[PDB]
């Protein structure tokens, strides 16, 4: 009862419940004050007065334990969340009054199992609807904001898998042979079928990705420089699929699970590419706005010399080996 005072559940409808708990604590405080009187008693076997005083105190406790059971049932009918309700139990985990609270808990345990089925079933229904959109890559998809279309699925799937897995680690902690109850067994059997279906979807995405990782590594090497249109307007040829791969690798490390084979070398240098692409750009631009600025029949040689100077590089360009630092700068001293 001393622990009961300290408890401040704070859940839903307020004060009115804590006031009811306070009045309950005051009644207890009157009873223990009357017990402290120790009139005769002093653990005297020959005296048959303590046995009478026990029966009086035992009756007061049985009345008190029934008020606690009623307060717990109110507080449980309030939170209306598997999490909020499991938090309530934890507060009274040390404040279980042996079998009288245990008789209430047996009924409470059945209601928790029913609540987890509804959430688990609801996730399954969201996963099936989502799975279609994720693979499709539609607008208004489960994938949230800027992620890869592949890594985004795995992070999405992980977020669902994590939601379902939190109550099970809590359910294992409950006593009174919850595992032996047939209702719990039906939830676990459902859970297993959902986890397997999610894992199968991840396995299809990673396998399909690993193939795309091998195809992308080829593009990089033979990417070089591309210059389009009648006007010579050379630009960065860097594949969008290489930028998405570069982002894809970072989110895999964040979720840990698994990592690609020989894509580490691309991700270490990744930073160096994102300085070199910007740095490169610098010059590239300047060239464009240099080409169109003329009206040129004056000062052909200079401009030509820049064309004749640039005319290799582009040829040179291979992401296999970047000596961009120089090139860049020699251009830059002349641009």
């Amino acid at each position: 009862f001393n622990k009961l005072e300290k408890i401040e559940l704070g859940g839903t409808k307020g004060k009115t419940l804590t006031e009811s708990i306070a009045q309950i604590f005051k009644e207890f405080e009157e009873a223990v004050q009357a017990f402290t009187s120790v009139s005769y008693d002093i653990m005297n076997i020959a005296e048959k007065k303590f046995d009478d005083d026990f029966y009086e105190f035992r009756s007061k406790i049985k009345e008190l334990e029934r008020r606690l059971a009623s307060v717990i049932t109110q507080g449980f009918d309030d939170y209306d969340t598997i999490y909020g309700r499991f938090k309530l139990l934890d507060n009274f985990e040390g404040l279980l009054t042996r079998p009288i609270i245990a008789d209430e808990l047996e009924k409470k345990h059945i209601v928790l199992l029913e609540m987890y089925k509804q959430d688990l079933k609801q996730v399954q229904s969201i996963f099936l609807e989502g799975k279609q959109f994720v693979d499709s890559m539609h607008e208004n998809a489960p994938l949230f904001l800027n992620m890869p279309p592949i890594a985004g699925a795995l992070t999405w799937c992980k977020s669902l898998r994590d939601r379902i897995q939190e109550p099970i680690e809590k359910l294992a902690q409950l006593g009174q042979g919850i595992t032996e109850r047939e209702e719990y067994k039906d939830v676990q059997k459902l859970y297993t079928s959902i986890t397997k279906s999610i894992k199968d979807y991840e396995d299809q995405k990673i396998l399909s990705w690993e193939k795309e990782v091998e195809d992308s590594s080829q593009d990089k090497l033979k990417q070089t420089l591309l210059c389009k249109d009648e006007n010579d307007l050379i630009k960065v040829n860097f594949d969008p699929s290489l930028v998405r791969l570069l982002k894809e690798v970072k989110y895999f490390l964040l979720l840990r699970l698994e990592v690609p084979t020989t894509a580490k070398d691309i991700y270490t240098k990744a930073e160096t590419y994102r300085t070199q692409i910007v740095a490169l750009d610098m010059i590239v631009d300047n060239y464009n706005h240099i080409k169109t600025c003329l009206l040129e029949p004056l000062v052909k040689k200079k401009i030509q010399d820049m064309e004749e100077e640039v005319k290799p590089g582009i040829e040179e360009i291979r992401w296999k080996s970047t000596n961009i630092d120089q090139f860049i700068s020699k251009s830059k001293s002349i641009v």
Binding site: I7, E8, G11, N140, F144, L145, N146, R163, L253, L254
Partner: protein, 355 residues
Amino acid sequence: VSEISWHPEGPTKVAVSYAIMRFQQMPEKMPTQAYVWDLLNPNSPEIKLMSPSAVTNISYNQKIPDQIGGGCYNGLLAVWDGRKGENPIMISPVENSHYEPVTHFHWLMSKTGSECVTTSTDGKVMWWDTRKFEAGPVEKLNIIEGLGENEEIIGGTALEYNVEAGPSKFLIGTESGSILTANKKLKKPVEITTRYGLDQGRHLGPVYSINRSNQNPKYFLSVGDWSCKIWVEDLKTPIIRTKYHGSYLSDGCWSPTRSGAFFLVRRDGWMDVWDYYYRQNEIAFSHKVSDSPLTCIKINQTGGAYHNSGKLCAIGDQDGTVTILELCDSLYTMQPKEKDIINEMFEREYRKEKN
């Protein structure tokens, strides 16, 4: 509609940005330009804000009347003038400004000539000077999680800053689901003090919006993944988790007027209101805005002419429509002994989490 902001004087104009947050799905040479609407002539936009790249987050600056500042998809920061508009007057350098898109941009009101702060999915928070864009930003903080030896750089998905909190604290949300706090010092260039939900409070997805009540600045909510949560200015674990929802939550904010009620917007299409004065178990009322998703909400701070504070709610759709909802004269107006009751409830919840 990637982000919305209200005019600081009163609810007369609503500046709104436009960009695709889906990756590489943006077309080649799509129209990159933010607009600014007036509530008198909602046919077409009052004034155009031409930008170098698509604008992700914008906001008005209360210090300088009509000076909108915005963060592009490139990583560039831009600043226009709401009267003349057209082209941007201040633009950051390309090389020193962060990689990947500006996820949040807010003004540091507590300063003579205004300053602006900016987070990204690169995971580098920055304190910019508007007068002096010069050679890059002033402050560079990379968002490490855990300390010790394990240092992973995680994308700063949301940033919250308030007058009552002061220029000391900057409340930052991350991709992994945690929430960090960066106290700027004149001593050591920056310090990351508190770690809200390293253990239990961890959101299942990225923390897309943080906000704190203007009435009680101690208490702030973060709208991560399916389920919104509420926190307290020291404690690690959240005080009140509020349900789960149909689809994810994009954004959510407190009523500037009323401490009790706060509005969430779902990617399903619905807005849903949680009035904690009456009921803590269920929703106050839900409302279909569009069949297309909702990417942002903003609420009118300060009132003028007909429209009082907390009445109009500008909501940004994925279709590109921006709806303005006049809320009920009960929802924005203060109910009797409202601020007292919510303070008592939160105090009770602070005692809960200690226990």
